[PDB]
Structure 1
């Protein structure tokens, strides 16, 4: 069963006993999921339960070497989508991607790694466009980074709140 990882996480994150909800604490810190992917098309969802004033979230995929005490997308090992302004971050460079997301939004994360690799983000089921093309080769994990005490909840499947239309994938729960 796929959860938020037990040790592979910044220790200041407040993770709930279910291992599916996480609260932030101070500066950007990361948590990865227990399972990762190396080939194929995979999907998972994140719900922003609570985003108080002056809180942000950068969500997406990370290789095992992504820095735990830094925002997702800080280095070459991760690609992220920022709640503030919808910016996309990779190697600490943020570029125009989409509109921002906030409290209550259910966000979608699609990756494709064929044996042409793609990262696509979803906002309440709607395709937000391709964010990254021909990404680095490696194992990619679902990952959450939070800047202060926001709360988000991750859903690996099997059933998603807003299954994207005409997209082929397997839920991350298949990994467990």
Structure 2
């Protein structure tokens, strides 16, 4: 019920029939999920199915105005985590955050929007730290940006590969 949005995606990205897998094409471009969140704590996972050394992803959360024809984290509307070097991006500013991630990894994506906000990334069940705090108010959508022909699969829940031990949340699938 919660899926990659067909109406809200860069045309060059290749979306699977089940709308849970996406393949990138050349320069960065983005797709958002069909549902977003404004309040409370929420979670989803992305698995990197394939990612050769020349490809890359920036994954995280975007409001509706985030530019689909640019990397996630490019403008004020999104916050992202780069596979290459584990850099965090927002308004096109890259900052050190964690170690990088790649093919085979299962990344977790936590947000908390009390109404104090926080974005936390996970790698294979391991909390990589609070990336951003007190973020721009608005509705946030799970988001995927890809560079070149890598492939990733998103899971909105309710069944996660590495359900975090250290905090409470609802699966994004609760919105569907």
Please report the TM-score for the alignment, with normalisation by the length of structure 2: 0.99
- How much does 1:166 deviate? 2.2
Unaligned runs of 5+ in 1: none
- How much does 1:53 deviate? 2.6
How far, CA to CA, are the matches of 1:24 and 1:166 in structure 2? 33
How far, CA to CA, are the matches of 1:44 and 1:73 in structure 2? 18
RMSD of equivalent CA atoms: 0.4
- How much does 1:154 deviate? 0.1
Whether 1:13 and 2:31 are equivalent positions in the alignment is no
Q: Paired residue for 2:43?
A: 43
- How much does 1:139 deviate? 0.3
Deviations 1:93-144 (A, max 9, x none): 0000000001000000000000100000000010000000000000000000
How far, CA to CA, are the matches of 1:150 and 1:109 in structure 2? 19
- The secondary structure found in structure 1 opposite 2:31 is strand
- How much does 1:52 deviate? 1.4
How far, CA to CA, are the matches of 1:45 and 1:167 in structure 2? 15
- How much does 1:7 deviate? 1.3
How far, CA to CA, are the matches of 2:45 and 2:11 in structure 1? 23
How far, CA to CA, are the matches of 1:29 and 1:158 in structure 2? 27
Please report the TM-score for the alignment, with normalisation by the length of structure 1: 0.99
Deviations 1:48-83 (A, max 9, x none): 000013000000000000000000000000000000
Q: Paired residue for 1:65?
A: 65
- The secondary structure found in structure 2 opposite 1:174 is helix
Q: Paired residue for 2:114?
A: 114
Aligned residues: 176
- The secondary structure found in structure 2 opposite 1:80 is strand
- How much does 1:175 deviate? 0.3
How far, CA to CA, are the matches of 2:71 and 2:15 in structure 1? 17
- The secondary structure found in structure 2 opposite 1:74 is coil
Deviations 1:12-58 (A, max 9, x none): 00000000000000000000000000000000000000001300000
